[PDB]
Design a protein around this ligand. Structure first.
Ligand SMILES: CC(=O)Nc1cc2c(cc1C)OCO2
Length: 185
């Protein structure tokens, strides 16, 4: 791919974070804490899952960023509508305003309804995410494997401004403590 030149500097929005997340000073890394992180509740925070949004909102153009997933056992990545549900239980699907992929139990899947099996020969340590707003495209790239395509959502109906979307996952196993990190341009 030749999407690198639409690179955008993403930062995480503390106010949207689940109350157990720890966001670094530079707003470029996030991990699961072992307890509540001593913040007040607000209507933006994801209540049920270890999720956080990027601060940036996109309503036009082409955007590209990269995320480090080294040593994680579980995570979700992609984009979502600014108006997605924050409270209670929900699935990740385009009908609910999400365009995502994930790792779970040693398998990679795209967040379609129902979910789609991904075919990845080289487990990724860094994921590239490309959004073309006007074309209605969200694509995922395996940076560890020379940028190979992972998945393309096409005919997307965004229906609003988009935000970068992250889920660090639970750490029930003791093997999923590692952070998600936004990689340098
Ligand atoms: C209905 C359902 O299983 N939802 C869900 C469960 C999760 C999660 C994210 C989502 C969307 O992060 C870890 O546990």
């Amino acid at each position: 791919h030749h999407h690198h030149h639409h690179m955008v500097h993403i930062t995480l929005d503390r106010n949207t974070a689940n109350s157990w997340l720890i966001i670094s000073k530079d707003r470029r890394q996030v991990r699961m804490g072992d307890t509540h992180q001593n913040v007040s509740d607000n209507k933006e925070r994801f209540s049920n899952y270890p999720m956080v949004l990027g601060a940036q909102r996109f309503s036009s153009g082409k955007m590209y960023w990269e995320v480090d997933v080294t040593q994680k056992e579980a995570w979700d990545l992609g984009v979502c509508r600014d108006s997605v549900q924050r409270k209670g239980q929900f699935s990740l699907s385009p009908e609910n305003g999400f365009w995502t992929i994930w790792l779970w139990q040693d398998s990679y899947e795209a967040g379609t309804s129902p979910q789609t099996t991904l075919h990845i020969q080289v487990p990724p340590c860094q994921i590239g995410i490309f959004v073309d707003y006007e074309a209605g495209v969200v694509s995922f790239y395996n940076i560890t494997d020379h940028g190979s395509l992972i998945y393309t959502f096409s005919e997307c109906v965004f229906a609003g401004p988009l935000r970068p979307f992250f889920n660090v996952g639970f750490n029930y196993s003791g093997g999923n403590a590692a952070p998600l990190k936004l990689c340098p341009l």
